[model samples]
Target: TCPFYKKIPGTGFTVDAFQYGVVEGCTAYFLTHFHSDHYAGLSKHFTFPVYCSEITGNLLKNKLHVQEQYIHPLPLDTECIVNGVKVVLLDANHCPGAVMILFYLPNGTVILHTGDFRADPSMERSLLADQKVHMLYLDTTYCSPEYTFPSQQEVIRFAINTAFEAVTLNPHALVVCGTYSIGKEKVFLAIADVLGSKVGMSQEKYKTLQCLNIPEINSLITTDMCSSLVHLLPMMQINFKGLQSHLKKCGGKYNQILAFRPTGWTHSNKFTRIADVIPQTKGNISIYGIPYSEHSSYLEMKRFVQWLKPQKIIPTVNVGTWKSRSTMEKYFREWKLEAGY
Candidate 1:
């Protein structure tokens, strides 16, 4: 009935209240973020009284276009009681409307659900002040030490610098910066802010940015305005051949052309072949690595869990067959604790 977990016969292990079958029994459900992984089953599978930050609620209702009848928005850093559970929404900092859920149970147990958070000082300070969290559901996607990422600000700066460098080196170059529809939209906006002109984005990217109210970044540009300046475009067409051809032409005309794709695309052999087609010159065609990821890095996740000091930590968002469960067990064992169900 519940969307989250199945219930045990006698133990306190019961389905979460937001499931389709158990809406009536649930006192309250907390949605930490509007990300698909975090709130996929919501709206359809669960219609319980859900609580979240005002930003999150708005994103769900207005941006995602989910029904708003069951949503209850709470101010950030404030506590509220629902269904006997004291809930608080803390800033997640991963996205515009993201948050961490803190549940203070009537039984004196406290749970801190770190829903896809990054280690930002503002968010850390807010969580540290609470000082009472028993169980922590952490986002450990990059729990391995090898998965390091630069700060979002750093990534933005890097992307801007790279774009500027590309334009300076080749005034006529077509610089394509690729990023996700939602998160990458911000990067594109940052570029526009610095460049003082709109960058051309694909229809899909334009639609995604439209959801975030970023269509004007592109719309501000007309043929009559800034026609002489180089065009910065967002590549969301997802056509490899077309992208390669576009890059080849840009590289031919300009001394350098910069195109950014998702991180893994640059690492692929197929992409390497396309890159090889471009004439090799000093910085002729360089794909700069701008570390932009929604998930927290290993150090960030570790610092968050340590701060919470949860008695029990469970990892969700598995890929089936206990792969993530085993990964969580390894994480717990690293902290010198017994890690098994």
Candidate 2:
């Protein structure tokens, strides 16, 4: 979140939410999603207007306790002039309410901040992909040769099917689907849709999801963890911290617990000869780590840049400035991706 925040070359507009440090004349801000990493420093209190998707704005105001007056709604595909520059939001495909912020300047300078998202063909036809892009602030969480994963849809299918299989045989077992407060909404919902069950959500995630206003998902939310067949939990608590004890207090009425986190980091161990890929066992607990990431992997990142052909690349959530023209170009220039790949 630090080095990734990029202000226009010469403008009062700052990309993404949060002031990394003390503000210095950054009156306007753009937010991509409700992820903690993206909006960690932001608070219920406020000073200036925050520009984001209508859903994200709703979450900030209704759930996160942000004042509605300070939240500004920037709907998708609609262009709005912020200061003197034309700004638009596109679907980021990472999670509900995530968006790609496009800044169109008078000088034909199109800067894109992807927030955090997986690869999608739709992006290739969006604003600057078919044209020129001055600079790109990419989501490079898995920016390396080691990272290789499937698409979000495929990953969601695998996780939902695998989880259903695990729970069907052991109906007495408690299936704890691990996810971020806002991320993994697809996986959580898919499991509910397929299993014909109302998934349980902690009060926090329920509040976060209520802001989205989806009827299909509205009935799916529940605080009654005891009745639901599946419980959607925060990824952090699934392992042993918060879940184990709660499941234990039930006193063996349930069979056991299963954990699945869709991410690209699981692929690193496949080629690294590292056994950390699949954790053996947390004392009888079974955890499944899947390559279901909301962000692009190493190969996908290269392909994304290759397709966009941007003049410069800036990796967010990592280093901002460096000696190389662009760290991404440096990584790809040496060897081009395969012909058909």
Candidate 3:
């Protein structure tokens, strides 16, 4: 469905629909994760009961300073009732504290809202597999068949190996990873851990990590950039020019820069293998656009849709851009036809 359509049909509950401040005719608000794009327009002024996973609640409290009374942290795999609707929060497998919301309306409607997730085989064993889902609110960030990318584990190992080889050849290279506030933490962390190096990041990112309550990660993070070769930077700052300026500012502390720009959008169908996606090097600055995506690929989403066999699918992302919704619907029809639905 349209992102503008925030209210879940047949229910008074709104989900990730904070941009309009207060939604009229809604009983409660349900947030799927702590990403700014999802939780945009949420603030202290509006007084509505917000429900989310425990980790997301902690992040909302610490980062956004949302009132604790307004937040209800629901544990994963636990069933609860809100506004006369049965609800369950399943692990989204996208970011920490992220969840795929399961709603069972009083009128016997079963809806599954996947809030930005990477589809995995493990989800097949979940309670969702047993349910006859009526509506599937899909995370269609990579809905098209062109967006097929390798698994996270494969991408991570590729990144680690690439970084290792780069640093092995050039010992003075600084490893930089393009990341968001919440997702893609594993990439840089794994890189640093394998290289026996600490992770240097911004103060704000450090604060965000603390809210996650992840053990031993605190020991790996540092505010000082020069203290560690592996540095976490915003996705915008991972370019060749950006890196050149950064290295210049370092004043010869590092001789070269190697950055891993990870996202599903970076993938191309032209490549047969992950290693085939070559890095673009400009002298000492090399940027590798790795398809280390957190979103589900075309095949994964197809598998999910076929498995669920939902009567309707409401795409949660890329609704207005390039007719993604219609394209996804076409794919859905094709998949269902193949599945004999």
Candidate 4:
């Protein structure tokens, strides 16, 4: 958080990742998740060893074509010594292999960086046992009151129920849902399980998941759209332009159609722009959006600080930007969340 890649005079360990791109330096490197933003500049040209979970490493090797030797798999929930710096990896509970990194530096100082995660109950249990954190690298991507929503489990359940209902309504209407190459694999898996049929996915998702291995989702991928009624596309891939082209190609031959988009950006404010999770109906497409998120909301973020009580807070995205430090201090002051110490 202190720009260690541009290492200062005091800190001994130098570490940097998701520099928005691949970077060099430090005894070791870490990757919290496989999101595009997290693995920027990481292409086949990357020949240096990178530390991350096995699922992430497999995706880098099989999908993105990163060299196998450069990919290192770190086991979660276990603390190990890397070049003498004690580090523990914890399940982020957001994405498949996403993790929160706890760095126990020499001199008894501890630091944490949540690559990308939601504050789940399991993570809270792990963090509460350790009460000392000098500085915290927070994933405050949704640290605003408007982000108050349900938990991940409940969110997934909601999408599953919606899809199930849509499919039951029209047996062959062709439900087209959105997703990402590396994100929201579980949503598709759950939909497939509930419907007792395969949910279509891009080859990229199939490749990585095959290596890490899962049961219900593998047989679901198909080359032809007509082969399956349910299609899972990258969340970013969806929009007016999203399945607009594909739906014509696949559903032009069907009877009825349904569209559902799952997202966490459910903005309720009217003048703040024109987007929220309240499910807007545009036209005859029968489109709807759900408020499913992979990051902590305002309530969860506040609870994190109150639970950990780190001496300083660092926002990962705004790190040192937009008068970043001062902005964080102001937000913290205005944040009326309960606290201890």
lDDT of each: 0.57, 0.72, 0.84, 0.67
Q: Quote the positional error of residue 309 for candidate 2 in Å.
A: 1.6
lDDT of 4 by residue, 1-341 (tens): 33542231123333345453433344466777777766766778876667788788877888788888888788877888776777888888777778888888777878888778888656668843665888777887776566676665776786678768877876766666776545566666677668876766666655666765455444655545556777777667566565566666774665544666766675543223223333444443556666667778777878777767787766775564667556666777665344545
Candidate structures ordered by TM-score, highest first: 3, 2, 4, 1
Top-TM-score candidate index: 3
- Whichever of 3 and 4 has more TM-score, that candidate is 3
- Full-model lDDT, candidate 2: 0.72
By lDDT: ranked, best first: 3, 2, 4, 1
> Candidate 3 residues 4-44, lDDT tens each?
44568888888898887556777889999888888988877
Could you tell me the TM-score of candidate 1? 0.72
Steric clashes per prediction: 1, 2, 0, 6
Off by over 4 Å in 4: 1-25, 219-224, 234-244, 251-253, 269-284, 320-327, 333-338
Top model by lDDT, which number? 3
lDDT of 2 by residue, 1-341 (tens): 33434666666777664757545767787788887767877887776878999889888887668887888888788779887778889998887789988887787788888888886777787765555777888887766676666566666777677668877888776666777666666766787777777888778777777778677666776888777767876678766657677687666678677766655565455564322345436765777776656777777777677777766666775554464336555675543444232
Candidate 1 at 157: error in angstroms?
2.8
Residues 49-88 of candidate 1: C-alpha lDDT, one tens digit per residue: 6677766676667555567788788887777766545667
Model 3 stretches astray by more than 4 angstroms: 1-5, 321-323
